[PDB]
Ligand binder design. Structure first.
Ligand SMILES: CC(C)(Cc1ccc2ccccc2c1)NC[C@@H](O)COc1cccc(Cl)c1C#N
Ligand SMILES: CC(C)(Cc1ccc2ccccc2c1)NC[C@@H](O)COc1cccc(Cl)c1C#N
Ligand SMILES: *[C@@H]1O[C@H](CO)[C@@H](O[C@@H]2O[C@H](CO)[C@@H](O)[C@H](O)[C@H]2NC(C)=O)[C@H](O)[C@H]1NC(C)=O
Ligand SMILES: *[C@@H]1O[C@H](CO)[C@@H](O[C@@H]2O[C@H](CO)[C@@H](O)[C@H](O)[C@H]2NC(C)=O)[C@H](O)[C@H]1NC(C)=O
Ligand SMILES: *[C@@H]1O[C@H](CO)[C@@H](O[C@@H]2O[C@H](CO)[C@@H](O)[C@H](O)[C@H]2NC(C)=O)[C@H](O)[C@H]1NC(C)=O
Ligand SMILES: *[C@@H]1O[C@H](CO)[C@@H](O[C@@H]2O[C@H](CO)[C@@H](O)[C@H](O)[C@H]2NC(C)=O)[C@H](O)[C@H]1NC(C)=O
Ligand SMILES: N[C@@H](Cc1c[nH]c2ccccc12)C(=O)O
Ligand SMILES: N[C@@H](Cc1c[nH]c2ccccc12)C(=O)O
Ligand SMILES: *[C@@H]1O[C@H](CO)[C@@H](O)[C@H](O)[C@H]1NC(C)=O
Ligand SMILES: *[C@@H]1O[C@H](CO)[C@@H](O)[C@H](O)[C@H]1NC(C)=O
Ligand SMILES: *[C@@H]1O[C@H](CO)[C@@H](O)[C@H](O)[C@H]1NC(C)=O
Ligand SMILES: *[C@@H]1O[C@H](CO)[C@@H](O)[C@H](O)[C@H]1NC(C)=O
Ligand SMILES: *[C@@H]1O[C@H](CO)[C@@H](O)[C@H](O)[C@H]1NC(C)=O
Ligand SMILES: *[C@@H]1O[C@H](CO)[C@@H](O)[C@H](O)[C@H]1NC(C)=O
Ligand SMILES: [Ca+2]
Ligand SMILES: [Ca+2]
Ligand SMILES: [Ca+2]
Ligand SMILES: [Ca+2]
Ligand SMILES: [Ca+2]
Ligand SMILES: [Ca+2]
Ligand SMILES: [Cl-]
Ligand SMILES: [Cl-]
Lengths: 799, 798
């Protein structure tokens, strides 16, 4: 090639820099002989990088210690960011070696993963160390194929993990990817997709672009972008590979998304245009750790076409800066500090420092060769190498074992994969208030040495979402489902995109975004929101509640009246005037009425086994013995008509036999109940589904049937015998009184039937207990009030 | 100068050539302690030598034919690549040497790889030299902005990934795993396949990359990932050498359940198709290109001999590897006595691609030779001469090449330099005679057909796991029968799920349902939540045994009433017993007719009129009957009531009496018609399964006061009857009427519990039975004695 930066010396290096951005887009129709294509657009950043390399080389040549007597020369070429020019230059590099089947010993060539691979395939064939400064693809680590490649820029797996970490930190799960179609974008987005699907993050679309894409492919890509709902768009590409898509996006006014820039185009001047920043607001990109090169800007300001004989690119540089010709003609007096261009309009050195570091590392390897001591070398017999006759593979061997200190005082040392690691800065795009150009204000940091999970660190106070608002935009497929509801599948959409369905009654969902409703335990139940389990609010006939205290009051006043009549009897015990009747029978009847009044107590509280298991036979025996005694408190016609009949001769104790017979019969059934089917004191849910009710299911139905039959037949026979003799003046015609009492007993039975048979849980027990209480109360009152009245009022009883 | 081993032959025009005679280079890790020298290759690839022989045969056959380029001879400088990049780049630097005594090559044939093709093309296209590859199938070599001078005769691999997705869809699998060689052949193909599968809703469990340089730990991780997965389909997208280590490790660890979907590179490779590996990998279904027919090829393959080959140079090492000589031997053995891939083949696939490439370049040269000075493709319609031909001319003519190959086929490279062909689909079968692996075609993938109608598989030929004959199950979660519905698992993809039972009131009829459905109120989820069968209704029917029994009782009562009526007719005007009010007797009898009729209002389905009249029907019927009975006795109050005599002075006042009482009653009735008539409506809340149809009386006070009125009438009549219960005037009807109202009150009391303690229909049933029994008792007790004394004992004087 003609245009190049050439300088002689004892040792020659090679450089490859993208001075231009691309080649002249034209189709070689092949109707005539094809010739060398000329590049089109200028790139001042590449010229700054070239100046950095030249500065490093000359500064090394000025230092007296590093390489004391030797001198470093160079043959730097231009690649125009394509492969053809790079391979032309590379063939111009290995010419002396090519004649095997000006020998350069090292090449610093970079800025394209594709270009870097294309060069390293050829340089590694002659074992020429190539130290790239910007090639960051993960494919260049396959040291089984790129034998002689080392890069002073970190790899690009950490960057994919960092983008995944950023997406996870802002709590997003619905994104979309876009990648240039070269060796830089594809592996990057593959690694990112892997790490994303690991972290449970869904990806909507995935398109590829390139600077040679025709309007139809870009149209399709813009349609895919527009016809989607994800707001986060991760981009892995370089400036020139993204310019057309961005042109289309800004011409179509797509102004909603959030761009996650990769390292290549995060700081590119092709994309950071004030026109573009309208529709591409809120970008968050990565950047390398800045560096310091003392006196570099002063060297930059010295460039001049006439005073540059080694450098040959200063001519076109001046022609491009001042826009002149060597239409208007140039003069060698212009002021480079006047015009504005990415040449001097920088604040931090990020890639230029990489070039400086690469040149200094190669120089340090050379110096290490210079200061070898025999017997301690790295070659066959621990031998050293002749620096005056140094070869490329020796420099490579020494570079693999290089370990020195940088200018900032950091330990530069290449990993066994030939690459040094480094932290990341995280940049947000801002609009400058005074000028109006884009400005990269650093808002985050990414440490690579720290353990997993604790690497990313962002400072959200500075981030400007769309420049207007101040809150993280929402970019999930579907809004979360608050507690009370649960997730639900959509048939085709990915897992990160669902709908919400309500928990059916009886189940609850406390946490948000739950996969399935939970059924409260039987003790508990759904709330009104189906959010919280509330207790089943169990219920039964309580004690302190008005009904319970009132029934207990009635019972105890019954006991009080009974004890009252007992006291009256005891005070006048020795008076058979009214006690001409069997005083023992009065004893028994009064105590039996006490027991009957007490029996009610067994139907109050919560039903355990004890409670009902004894509450049925309690009333049973009590009322049957009461009715038997009041039956015997009558005429003995059948007894007079009838061992047993021998005992029916004299002695009142025979009457007792009667009761001590019939109750015996009764207790038989009861003891049957004891060991045949005791009433199950158990709970019930089926009746209410909301509140448990505790009852007792009598296991022996026919047994209680027989019991009730026995007591009612006793009642029938006693009532009939009473009525048949209801009009006999036997001491105030007591027969009419006993008819009255047993009649009201029958009324109690009848009017009790409908009550319990047509009421809810607690009130059934309440009505049963009030029925038994009223029955026994009425019977006792009717039997004893006449006698107590006549005794307390008129003690004239003779016949 | 290139390497030492090559195949060189002079001529007017020279063609390039790159073939993988070996399989790789020795693992010599240069510590760089000494000057690194040319690395040497290790294994031998007889298939590569067959390809090279195919190219040489094509060239010499061209040189023998007098039609294509007459008076012209073709030459070649074929080199070896050993399947690496450095060797190919050495050969290519030798190629382009004369460009910028040394021959000037004008066309290069093939690179056999994708990385090798890319490396060679980046350098060749710099000088615009046409490179016609025969086996490079990456999709990246179609970008005609990078590789300006690259055309291939093997189809691009996009359709191959599409066909992988189509195969996976055809057997209905949705849980697979992928493996790809980490080079330019596996990565783009596996990316395209991932995209296509994601389109067709196919979940990918794992995805790993391998290479022939993978150290033991990486293969360890890969095999661990393979074991810990539940998938069975493993889509491998790689070549033989890059897969050999993984297959070694797998057959060492004895993983047998999986099934493999082979890409074209290794679906027919002798490196993997070995019985040892076949005993483990089981069933593989791979692709292959369409065969070709090179006439008279075997007769040229059988002529190879070391001393007879001066132009060829690889024949020496070939003889060595096939005979183990130079244990030196003579050099007269027969090559047919050895079993190597150099002759153990049935169809030519890639060798035909090489033959086609050579013939295509020769045809472009011919087209250049047969110019017409006015129609040349070059400038001003002119064209160049055959004697000073340059590479770019051949490239230009190859872009516009369109000719016919001996298979009667049309060959033309499209705008992307590729060709197009329709794939065969093979399955790995074990030879029942020898034990070697044999590939048997089972299907065909036609790419010209419309999308979705391209794949044809003859499933009767496939052999699953060597013995079985039914498609294996390789889904993630078992497809569960209807009645259940899908349920998300946290973290797992959309192909792994649970399924839970549909709660009642909801149903799911089809497999793979997302949610159940609420049934229409007339229906309900059946026993298995599968179908909304009609929700059963329930009420007192007619043809039900109870209905027919009750209407039988009713018609028997009506018949007894008609009997007593006829008895009255035949003996009307004889007041011997009829001295009483015959008219009021007919009134009571009609009242009993209405009472017996009152049954018909509580039988079937409740309409509005039905119950809205069923209440007042019984109401008025009874109150009228009982009031006429109350007046069918002594008239003390009537006798006591000055203006009343002037009003009636006769029995008419009795009518007045009843036409007062009933009237009062009927008042409430009409009120009920226009305050809250009982609505005939349904009821579900008690069973959620059976519908109950009843009537709700909006005014409880109406029915309350009505029943209170009728029972107080009954009670006052009962008291009045019991008052004078002992007056034997005409058989002492007082006792009969006391028994009447007594049985009435028994009916009332004993009816209360039954209706107040039973399920729906039986409430109305027992109400019917109670009313019928009350009217029965009334009729019987009142009139049985009269009809008996009339029919039996003719003694009527007092
Ligand atoms: C058992 C029952 C539900 C009434 C019943 C049930 C089924 C029956 C089947 C055939 C025949 C008679 C039956 C009577 N409730 C009774 C129990 O509370 C026990 O309480 C009493 C039982 C009898 C008499 C009285 Cl004063 C009470 C009270 N207080
Ligand atoms: C209304 C009722 C449920 C009984 C009832 C209800 C609530 C009441 C509230 C206060 C006071 C009395 C009430 C009586 N069932 C009655 C209806 O079937 C009407 O059927 C009759 C009503 C009265 C007498 C007879 Cl012989 C029948 C019959 N057959
Ligand atoms: C979008 O989806 C993500 C994925 O969960 C949601 O992130 C959750 O946010 C809450 C809020 O603190 C965290 O408690 C959870 O830990 C996050 N999920 C997980 C699995 O960790 C995010 O909330 C969703 N965005 C919106 C607006 O709802
Ligand atoms: C990458 O991470 C941090 C910078 O954020 C560096 O580690 C810190 O360095 C300072 C001074 O060197 C120490 O005082 C801190 O203790 C370190 N903090 C942590 C968490 O490590 C680290 O040096 C950076 N990497 C490089 C190559 O500079
Ligand atoms: C593509 O596959 C199909 C069938 O395998 C081939 O197309 C057939 O060609 C012959 C003659 O045109 C017809 O008899 C068949 O009907 C065709 N198939 C159909 C569906 O029409 C074709 O040969 C294959 N492609 C190539 C290049 O050979
Ligand atoms: C594995 O999953 C697939 C779908 O993911 C099942 O195929 C579906 O089920 C029947 C069978 O054809 C069809 O109604 C559906 O259309 C199929 N889906 C598709 C996309 O075709 C397949 O049945 C499952 N495998 C087994 C053994 O059940
Ligand atoms: N890593 C980039 C190289 C790069 C880094 N920063 C850049 C800035 C501009 C252009 C290219 C770059 C690549 O693979 O291509
Ligand atoms: N397409 C394959 C080349 C190939 C086809 N068939 C083959 C058989 C053996 C080896 C390689 C091949 C590749 O990209 O690498
Ligand atoms: C582009 O979109 C924004 C927001 O809707 C709107 O303000 C503007 O008018 C649109 N058109 C142009 C040319 O920007
Ligand atoms: C012109 O050149 C010199 C700097 O060397 C000085 O006069 C001045 O800074 C320059 N002009 C501007 C605008 O900086
Ligand atoms: C590298 O150089 C530094 C400088 O002292 C030293 O600490 C270190 O031991 C050297 N070796 C390695 C492997 O870092
Ligand atoms: C390999 O696995 C299969 C599974 O059945 C088993 O039959 C066979 O014995 C195993 N062979 C070895 C060497 O482990
Ligand atoms: C090889 O030897 C002769 C010569 O080719 C041939 O006739 C014969 O068929 C072959 N025999 C074997 C075993 O290959
Ligand atoms: C060229 O293509 C056309 C149709 O595409 C076909 O008719 C013709 O046979 C082909 N060959 C030549 C020499 O035209
Ligand atoms: Ca470059
Ligand atoms: Ca840029
Ligand atoms: Ca889909
Ligand atoms: Ca090759
Ligand atoms: Ca093979
Ligand atoms: Ca997961
Ligand atoms: Cl910079
Ligand atoms: Cl073959």
């Amino acid at each position: 090639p003609n245009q190049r930066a050439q300088k002689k010396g004892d040792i020659i290096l090679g450089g490859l820099f993208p001075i231009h951005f691309g080649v002249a887009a034209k189709d070689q129709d092949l109707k005539s002989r094809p010739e060398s294509v000329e590049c089109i657009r200028y790139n001042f950043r590449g010229f700054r990088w070239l100046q950095a390399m030249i500065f490093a080389i000359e500064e090394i040549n000025n230092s007296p210690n590093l390489l004391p007597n030797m001198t470093l020369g160079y043959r730097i070429f231009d690649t125009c960011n394509t492969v053809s020019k790079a391979l032309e230059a590379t063939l111009s590099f290995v010419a002396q070696n090519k004649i095997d089947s000006p020998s350069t010993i090292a090449v610093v060539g970079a800025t394209g993963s594709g270009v870097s691979t294309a060069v390293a395939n050829l340089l590694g064939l002659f074992y020429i160390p190539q130290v790239s400064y910007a090639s960051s693809s993960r494919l260049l680590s396959n040291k089984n194929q790129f034998k002689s490649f080392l890069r002073t820029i970190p790899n690009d797996e950490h960057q994919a993990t960092a983008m995944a970490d950023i997406i996870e930190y802002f709590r997003w799960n619905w994104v979309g990817t876009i990648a240039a179609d070269d060796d830089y974008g594809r592996p990057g987005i593959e690694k990112f997709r892997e790490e994303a699907e690991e972290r449970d993050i869904c990806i909507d679309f995935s398109e590829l672009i390139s600077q040679y894409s025709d309007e139809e492919e870009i149209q399709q890509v813009v349609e895919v972008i527009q016809n989607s709902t994800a707001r986060v768009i991760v981009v892995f590409s370089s400036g020139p590979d993204l310019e057309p898509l961005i042109k289309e996006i800004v011409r179509r006014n797509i102004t909603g998304k959030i761009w996650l820039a990769s390292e290549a185009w995060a700081s590119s001047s092709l994309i950071a245009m004030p026109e573009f920043f309208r529709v591409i607001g809120s970008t968050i990109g990565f950047a390398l750790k800045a560096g310091q090169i003392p006196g570099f800007r002063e060297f930059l300001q010295k460039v001049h076409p006439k005073k540059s004989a080694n450098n040959g690119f200063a001519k076109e540089f001046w022609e491009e800066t001042f826009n002149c010709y060597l239409r208007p003609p140039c003069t060698g007096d212009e002021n480079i500090t006047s015009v504005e261009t990415p040449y001097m309009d920088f604040t931090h050195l990020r890639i230029s420092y990489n070039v400086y570091l690469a040149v200094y590392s190669i120089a340090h390897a050379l110096q290490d060769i210079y200061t070898c001591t025999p017997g301690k070398g790295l070659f066959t017999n621990g031998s050293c190498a002749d620096i005056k006759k140094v070869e490329a593979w020796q420099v490579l061997k020494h570079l693999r074992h290089l370990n020195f200190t940088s200018n900032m005082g950091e330990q530069v040392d290449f990993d066994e994969f030939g690459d040094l690691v480094g932290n990341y800065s995280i940049i947000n795009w801002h609009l400058s208030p005074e000028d109006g150009s884009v400005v990269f204000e650093e808002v985050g940091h990414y440490n690579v040495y720290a353990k997993k999970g604790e690497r990313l660190f962002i400072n959200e106070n500075k981030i400007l979402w769309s420049g207007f608002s101040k809150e993280v935009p929402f970019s999930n497929c579907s809004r979360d489902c608050l507690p009370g509801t649960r997730k639900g599948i959509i048939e085709g959409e990915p897992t990160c995109c669902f709908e919400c369905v309500d928990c059916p009654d009886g189940e609850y969902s406390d946490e948000t975004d739950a996969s399935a409703c939970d059924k409260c335990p039987e003790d508990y139940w759904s709330n009104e929101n189906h959010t919280s389990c509330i207790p089943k609010q169990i219920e039964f006939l309580s004690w302190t509640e008005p009904f319970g205290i009132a029934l207990t009051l009635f019972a105890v006043l019954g006991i009080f009246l009974t004890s009252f009549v007992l006291g009256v009897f005891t005070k006048f015990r020795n008076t058979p005037i009214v006690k001409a009747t069997n005083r023992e029978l009065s004893y028994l009847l009064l105590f039996s009425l006490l027991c009957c009044f007490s029996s009610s107590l067994f139907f109050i509280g919560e039903p355990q086994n004890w409670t009902c298991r004894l509450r049925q036979p309690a009333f049973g025996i009590s009322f049957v013995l009461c009715i038997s005694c009041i039956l015997v408190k009558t005429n003995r016609v059948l007894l007079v008509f009838e061992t047993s009949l021998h005992r029916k001769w004299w002695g009142l104790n025979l009457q007792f036999l009667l009761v001590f017979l019939c109750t015996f019969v009764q207790i038989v059934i009861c003891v049957i109940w004891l060991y045949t089917a005791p009433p199950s004191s158990y709970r019930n849910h089926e009746l209410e589904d909301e509140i448990i009710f505790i009852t007792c299911h009598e296991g022996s139905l026919m047994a209680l049937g027989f019991l009730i039959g026995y007591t009612c037949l006793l009642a029938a026979i006693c009532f009939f015998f009473a009525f048949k003799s209801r009009k006999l003046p036997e001491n105030f015609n007591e027969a009419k009184f006993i008819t009255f009492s047993m009649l009201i007993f029958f009324i109690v039975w009848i009017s009790f039937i409908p009550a319990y048979a047509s009421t809810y849980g607690k009130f059934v027990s309440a009505v049963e207990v009030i029925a038994i209480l009223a029955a026994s109360f009425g019977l006792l009152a009717c039997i004893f009030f006449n006698k107590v009245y006549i005794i307390l009022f008129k003690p004239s009883r003779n016949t």
